From a paper:
As one of the most well-known class B1 G-protein-coupled receptors (GPCRs), the glucagon-like peptide-1 receptor ([name]) is a clinically validated drug target for type 2 diabetes and obesity. Ago-allosteric modulators are capable of acting both as agonists on their own and as efficacy enhancers of orthosteric ligands. Here we report high-resolution cryo-electron microscopy (cryo-EM) structures of human [name]–Gs in complex with compound 2 alone, with both compound 2 and endogenous peptidic agonist [name]-1, or with compound 2 and a small molecule agonist (LY3502970). Collectively, our structures reveal an ago-PAM mechanism for [name], in which the rearrangement of the conserved polar network is trigged by TM6 movement and stabilized by the ECD-TMD interaction.
After sorting by constitutive 2D and 3D classifications, 3D consensus density maps were reconstructed with global resolutions of 2.5 Å (without ECD) or 3.3 Å (with ECD) for compound 2 alone, 2.5 Å for compound 2 plus [name]-1, and 2.9 Å for compound 2 plus LY3502970, respectively. Instead of occupying the orthosteric binding pocket where peptide or small molecule agonists generally bind, the high-resolution cryo-EM map demonstrates that compound 2 is covalently bonded to C3476.36b (Wootten numbering in superscript) and mounted on the membrane-facing surface of the cytoplasmic end of TM6, providing solid structural evidence of a unique binding site for the ago-allosteric modulator. Compound 2 forms predominantly hydrophobic interactions with the adjacent residues in TM6. The tert-butyl moiety of compound 2 points to TM7 and makes hydrophobic contacts with A3506.39b and K3516.40b, replacement at the C-3 position by polar functional groups caused a dramatic decline in its potency and efficacy. The dichloroquinoxaline group extends to ICL3 forming nonpolar interactions with K3466.35b, C3476.36b, and a cholesterol molecule in TM6, the introduction of electron-donating substituents or replacement of quinoxalines by benzimidazole or quinoline at C-6 and C-7 positions led to poor tolerance. The most profound structural feature in the extracellular half of compound 2-bound [name] is the unique position and orientation of ECD, distinct from all available full-length [name] structures reported to date. Notably, the orientation of ECD is distinct from that of [name]-1-bound [name] with a rotation angle of 97.4 degrees: the former pointed from ECL2 to TM1-TM2 and the latter oriented from ECL1 to TM5-TM6. The tip of the N-terminal α-helix (T29) moved by 19.9 Å and inserted into a cleft between TM1 and TM2, partially overlapping with the recently reported allosteric site of PAM LSN316044017. In the case of compound 2-bound structure, the N-terminal α-helix of ECD penetrated to the TMD core and formed extensive contacts with residues in TM1-3, ECL1, and ECL2, resulting in an ECD-TMD interacting surface area of 1438.4 Å2, similar to other small molecule agonists.
Numbering used by the authors:
A (entry chain G): 7 to 62
B (entry chain A): 11 to 64, 207 to 254, 262 to 394
C (entry chain B): 3 to 340
D (entry chain R): 29 to 56, 61 to 128, 136 to 339, 343 to 368, 380 to 424
E (entry chain N): 1 to 126
Write the structure that this text describes.
């Protein structure tokens, strides 16, 4: 009965455990790097002029 | 040219908006009813008689009024989420099997799911029509006295029948006690929270009862009427 | 053997938790303190798309960033033109309780799914212009909560069946079934590369699936209530979730845990829809308090508010150029903001 | 104020009397002169006429001590040093309780209409500027507000035009120059607009009642077609009985700017439909109160003090003030209630209404957060 | 991680007294409504007794009224159920459960067959 559920859950736990995790500091750096690099192409972060706003 | 294609868009949109008006005239005319219930609660027979005598979807029409009942079937038993789909629903039809046993306190299970419907902040304006089903099997059960509700509800013994009792011919006091006692166990939740927004309309039905389609129709008129009377703050 | 295998499960979970803390050498609250705020984002309603008859449950942009599809509980799958505010098609659905809808990235098809446990496919680019059913993808034993069109005749459907699925439309049979969620799977979001997708469920957990392999590549816990919406970060290496917990969490596929929590003490309402800005710095979130909050994705600060909906905001959507925000709500109005 | 009317009638009748008097008695000093607007009496030679100022103006009894002294010459009447032929005379000498009572009443009633008009255009602007309040009941409310506003401006006109005419005539002791406007079709047609504004107000109250009652009873109706039907009724059936009343006044009745309902049967043409509107509003009111008390009696402590608030909120909306009206205190209340019912409806359905208090709340806080 | 571990069950003779401790960890206990459910042998998950976040509103199932009593420690994130004067029907696996949404009076689907925020249960044999 639940033996199949238990074996599936434990194989999923070991499949999720054996992964190449990265430090949160590097992930934070990558997150702020993308947010800083693509800030220029965000027309809501920097308010786009209405002259090139098709929704005006 | 772009003016001509824009005018073609305007003409297609005009046709579509005419069709949407024609479709809304049907939408706000049909009444949406969510039909809940426990396992083999006898609600299937009520579906059948409301179907033929004039998830699963039922469109019927009583007194020229259209009703759509949505028996949630082939769905899981975690009603937490799809029940948010039922706010525009005029009435949540709650079916309780009053004599579900002769498995394990299906009545208290219905009381707690009922409490969770009223205290749900999205159903805080959707009224609940309450069908206490299997009033006939509870008759023979409690008048027999071999399977009691007193072992499940000691205040039943300390509960006296209300003066508003209207026993049917053949309804001995031992059954109209349990009949009205359970009803006030639900009204203890229906009155201790959310007054004036939603209302509970408990009824006593059975597989042989057929005017259940008018008891629900009368109380969905009551639901809409109270929704309007509170739109003008007349109530 | 059950108690000992539960012990094995708990110690392996503890191992994963300790490995996450060992990966926790800092936080965003410490590294991004030197990151300048985005200021006050005061966005105003540009267009008002009216015409739906019931609560608007779903909305999705076309690849042209012009055309939307909006699914509403009245039984309509309306195609809008946001530039000409014009309805192109008004698709009546067989089941009124449409809980999701998708616009094919090729533009050819449009999906819709709900309590009928069926994802209905309509063909937009038809020879006569009449949008007609191509397939009815039955096979889920639960309501269809979110369907996203994959490119090559594939569709990723999430159900209340607690099981996701990748369907091959031409045949009509799902090629893969993504299992592992214990609660109703509520929302999907295809990654930019459309090779992995993320699933939110009412177990407060999100699962990163490999659509090519069929395995849950990653399970993200940390939310406290039912995950109502999920959306990928623009780089496809992180995703944001919104739940009834009244908080948004930002998980990273590499950090394997939460990056930021977007909550406010005066916010007690569940988050129903999530979207991103082009930079991923602005976090669009629909709420139950009838307004959308634009959270600062790097500081958890409410950078702005998109208010003006008279009822619960159910679906958000950003234009492919990021030029506008469509917000459908339970007030039957789909508003375009900029 | 009250009416430059009957003093005009007075003038005319008066002239007819002493015209024949002077013709019957020709004086054999002073010679006969008819100034075309004033008949003098028959006196005696060798004596002088010393009489108070004429009686056709009610203010002659205000200060009866005022006197008329007109001396005579062989040439009769004065011609002045300037280019003027009007005889040298001073007659405003006797011009400055019912007066006070009616005055305070009318000013209080105009204050009521003014406050109702101001608050009601504010209320209409509120109903229009949120776009979430746009429903069909709020469209009926906006039409009812507009009809009340139309009747308010119409009463402003009806009292200012009379005021103006009275002012001019009395001011110059004139009484000529404005009867050419009273005998024109212009004030008659604007008076037809007045009766139409009144009738449209009563019938938009009727439409409000009909809408609420059918909302409670027959919920199967097409709100696109039924709203056009209700607008057509509220704005046209008042036309459908105001313009035949107009043509009846045109064909059958005399001058007087149609303000003299001397033949009350012809005014019944517009009286009876308004009474019908009031009766049906009353029937709908009693049916809705029966329904409300039925919903209260089916509920669970004291329904009286809540039914009191409900009934007091329902009276001005359907305009059931009139059921008793349809003699000072009688006209006082029949005026004050209809004057303040605009303010009462505006308050009760656009200020203390919970949905607009919510709308407003939202908008206010939104902009507050914005700034 | 919503963690609901429980202790204090076991074997007791009929008529005894027991106190089940529900040590919650991973979700802020004071934010969400808590209760006990139990699954007696016979395939029935039944709700037992409610207690609000603050502990002001407490209800009981009829078969356990006056003889069962619940407390809550929002500080230690623990819920207790003192089970006095036990009956042979009281043999059951008791699950300490919390309803899904915080700051809600509504309590959905705690008694569902596969609820997510329901404890691991402790067996109490009478
Ligand atoms: C803020 C805006 C929307 C409200 C405007 C209310 C205005 C229209 C109200 C306020 C005061 C009112 C005036 C004050 C009194 C008189 C004198 C009366 O013999 C004729 C009407 C007249 C001239 C009123 C006309 C309407 C009036 C001007
Ligand atoms: C004498 C003057 C002030 C009367 C003018 C009538 C105005 C105030 C009333 C009468 C009919 C009303 C309109 C009828 C219905 C609609 C359609 C709706 O989609 C927008 C509001 C709108 C357009 C209403 C706006 C206000 C309105 C135009
Ligand atoms: C003296 C002037 C200001 C009186 C104006 C009265 C106005 C406000 C009333 C009287 C007649 C009414 C119209 C009667 C008929 C129609 C046609 C219908 O399909 C739309 C509403 C519409 C267009 C009404 C709009 C409001 C209306 C124009
Ligand atoms: C003498 C008449 C004209 C004036 C009396 C006031 C009238 C208009 C109002 C005031 C209170 C109202 C009553 C209060 C409530 C009820 C009880 C209900 O079961 C029947 C209608 C009835 C009886 C209402 C009828 C109309 C009513 C009597
Ligand atoms: C007297 C004139 C000037 C104003 C009329 C007063 C009317 C509008 C008010 C004042 C007191 C009110 C009544 C007070 C309470 C009750 C008892 C309730 O069971 C029926 C309604 C009824 C009877 C109310 C009906 C309306 C009422 C009669
Ligand atoms: C001439 C005098 C009598 C006019 C008085 C107008 C008063 C009664 C009306 C007009 C504006 C109204 C306010 C409009 C907005 C709000 C904010 C809402 O959150 C509470 C009600 C409140 C505070 C209303 C109270 C009543 C109010 C102040
Ligand atoms: C409360 N009770 C009553 C009772 C009666 Cl008999 C009359 Cl006439 C009026 C009442 N009014 C109230 N409440 C107010 C309206 C707030 C004074």
């Amino acid at each position: 009965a639940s033996i199949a559920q238990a074996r599936k859950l434990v194989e999923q736990l070991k499949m999720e455990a054996n992964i190449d995790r990265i430090k949160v500091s590097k992930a934070a750096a990558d997150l702020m790097a993308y947010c800083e690099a693509h800030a220029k192409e965000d027309p809501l972060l920097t308010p786009v002029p209405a002259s090139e706003n098709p929704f005006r | 040219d772009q003016r001509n294609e824009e005018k073609a868009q305007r003409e297609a949109n005009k046709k579509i908006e005419k069709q949407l008006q024609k479709d809304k005239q049907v939408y706000r005319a049909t009444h949406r009813l969510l039909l809940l219930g426990a396992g083999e609660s006898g609600k299937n027979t009520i579906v059948k008689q409301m179907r033929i005598l004039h998830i699963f979807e039922t469109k019927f029409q009583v007194d020229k009024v259209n009703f759509h009942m949505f028996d949630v079937g082939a769905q899981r038993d975690e009603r937490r989420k799809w029940i948010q789909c039922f706010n525009d629903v005029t009435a949540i039809i709650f079916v309780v099997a009053s004599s579900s046993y002769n498995q394990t306190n299906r009545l208290q299970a219905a009381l707690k799911l009922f409490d969770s419907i009223w205290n749900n902040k999205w159903l805080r304006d959707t009224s609940v029509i309450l069908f206490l089903n299997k009033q006939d099997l509870l008759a023979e059960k409690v008048l027999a006295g071999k399977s009691k509700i007193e072992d499940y509800f000691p205040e039943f013994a300390r509960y006296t029948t209300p003066e508003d009792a209207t026993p049917e011919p053949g309804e001995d006091p031992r059954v109209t006690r349990a009949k009205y006692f359970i009803r006030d166990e639900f009204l203890r939740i229906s009155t201790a929270s959310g007054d004036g927004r939603h209302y509970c309309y408990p009824h006593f039905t059975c597989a042989v009862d057929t005017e259940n389609i008018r008891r629900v129709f009368n109380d969905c008129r009551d639901i809409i009427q109270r929704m309007h009377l509170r739109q003008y703050e007349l109530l | 053997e059950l108690d000992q295998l539960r012990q094995e499960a708990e110690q392996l979970k503890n191992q994963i938790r300790d490995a996450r803390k060992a990966c926790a050498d800092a936080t965003l609250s410490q590294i991004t303190n030197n990151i300048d705020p985005v200021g006050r984002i005061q966005m105003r309603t540009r267009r008002t798309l009216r015409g739906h008859l019931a609560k608007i449950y779903a909305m999705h942009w076309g690849t042209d960033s012009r055309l939307l599809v909006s699914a509403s509980q009245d039984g309509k799958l309306i195609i809008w033109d946001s530039y000409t505010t014009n309805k192109v098609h008004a698709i009546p659905l067989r089941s009124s309780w449409v809980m999701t809808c998708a616009y094919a990235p090729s533009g050819n098809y449009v999906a819709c799914g709900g309590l009928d446990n069926i994802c209905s496919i309509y063909n937009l680019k038809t020879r006569e212009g009449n949008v007609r059913v191509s397939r009815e993808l039955a096979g889920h034993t639960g309501y269809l909560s979110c369907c996203r069109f994959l490119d090559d005749n594939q569709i990723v459907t999430s159900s209340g069946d607690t099981t996701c699925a990748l369907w091959d439309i031409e045949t009509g049979q799902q090629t893969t079934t993504f299992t592992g969620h214990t609660g109703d799977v509520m929302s999907l979001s295809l990654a930019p590369d459309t090779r992995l997708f993320v699933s939110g469920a009412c177990d407060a957990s999100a699962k990163l699936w490999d659509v090519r392999e069929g395995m849950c590549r990653q399970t993200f816990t940390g939310h406290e209530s039912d995950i109502n919406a999920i959306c990928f970060f623009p780089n496809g290496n992180a995703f944001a979730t919104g739940s009834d917990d009244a908080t948004c969490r930002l998980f990273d596929l590499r950090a394997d845990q939460e990056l930021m929590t977007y909550s406010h003490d005066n916010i007690i309402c569940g988050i129903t829809s999530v979207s991103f800005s082009k930079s991923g710095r602005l976090l669009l979130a629909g709420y139950d308090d009838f307004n959308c909050n634009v959270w600062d994705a790097l500081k958890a600060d409410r950078a702005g508010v998109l208010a003006g909906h008279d009822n619960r905001v159910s679906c958000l959507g950003v234009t492919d150029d990021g030029m506008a925000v469509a917000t459908g709500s339970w007030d039957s109005f789909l508003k375009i903001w900029n | 104020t009250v009416s430059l009317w009957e003093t005009v009638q007075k003038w005319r009748e008066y002239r007819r009397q002493c015209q024949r008097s002077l013709t019957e008695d020709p004086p054999p000093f002073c010679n006969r002169t008819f100034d075309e607007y004033a008949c003098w009496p028959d006196g005696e030679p060798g004596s002088f006429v010393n009489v108070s100022c004429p009686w056709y103006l009610p203010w002659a009894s205000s200060v009866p001590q005022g006197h008329v002294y007109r001396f005579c010459t062989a040439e009769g009447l004065w011609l002045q040093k300037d280019n003027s032929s009007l005889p040298w005379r001073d007659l405003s000498e006797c011009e400055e309780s019912p007066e006070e009572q009616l005055l305070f009443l009318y000013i209080i009633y105009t204050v009521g209409y003014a406050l109702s008009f101001s608050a009601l255009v504010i209320a209409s602007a509120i109903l229009l500027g949120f776009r979430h309040l746009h429903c069909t009941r709020n469209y009926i409310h906006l039409n009812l507000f507009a009809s009340f506003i139309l009747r308010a401006l119409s009463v402003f006109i009806k009292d200012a035009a009379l005021k103006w005419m009275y002012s001019t005539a009395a001011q110059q002791h004139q009484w000529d120059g404005l009867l050419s406007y009273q005998d024109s079709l212009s004030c008659r047609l604007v008076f037809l607009l007045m009766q139409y504004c009144v009738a449209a107000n009563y019938y938009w109250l009727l439409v409000e009642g009909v809408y609420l009652y059918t909302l409670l009873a027959f919920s199967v109706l097409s709100e696109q077609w039924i709203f056009r039907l209700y607008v057509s009724i509220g704005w046209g059936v008042p036309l459908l009985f105001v313009v035949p009343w107009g043509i009846v006044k045109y064909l059958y009745e005399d001058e007087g700017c149609w303000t003299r309902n001397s033949n009350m049967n012809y005014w019944l043409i517009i009286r009876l439909p308004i009474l019908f509107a009031i009766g049906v509003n009353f029937l709908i009111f009693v049916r809705v109160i029966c329904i409300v008390v039925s919903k209260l009696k089916a509920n669970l402590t004291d329904i009286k003090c809540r039914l009191a608030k409900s009934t007091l909120t329902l009276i001005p909306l359907l305009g059931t003030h009139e059921v008793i009206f349809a003699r000072f205190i009688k006209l006082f209340t029949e005026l004050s209630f209809t004057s303040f019912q605009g303010l009462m409806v505006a308050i009760l359905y656009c200020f203390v209404n919970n949905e607009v208090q919510l709308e407003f709340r939202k908008s206010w806080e939104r902009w507050r957060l914005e700034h | 991680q919503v963690q609901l571990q429980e202790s204090g069950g076991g074997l007791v003779q009929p008529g005894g007294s027991l106190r089940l401790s529900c040590a919650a960890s991973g979700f802020t206990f004071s934010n969400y409504k808590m209760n006990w459910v139990r699954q007696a042998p016979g395939k029935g998950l039944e709700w037992v007794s409610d207690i609000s976040q603050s502990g002001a509103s407490i209800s009981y199932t009829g078969s356990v009224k006056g003889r069962f009593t619940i407390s809550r420690d929002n500080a230690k994130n623990t819920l207790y159920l003192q089970m006095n004067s036990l009956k042979p029907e009281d043999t059951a696996v008791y699950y300490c459960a919390r309803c899904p949404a915080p700051f809600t009076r509504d309590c959905f689907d705690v008694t569902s067959t596969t609820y997510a925020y329901r404890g691991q249960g402790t067996q109490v044999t009478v």
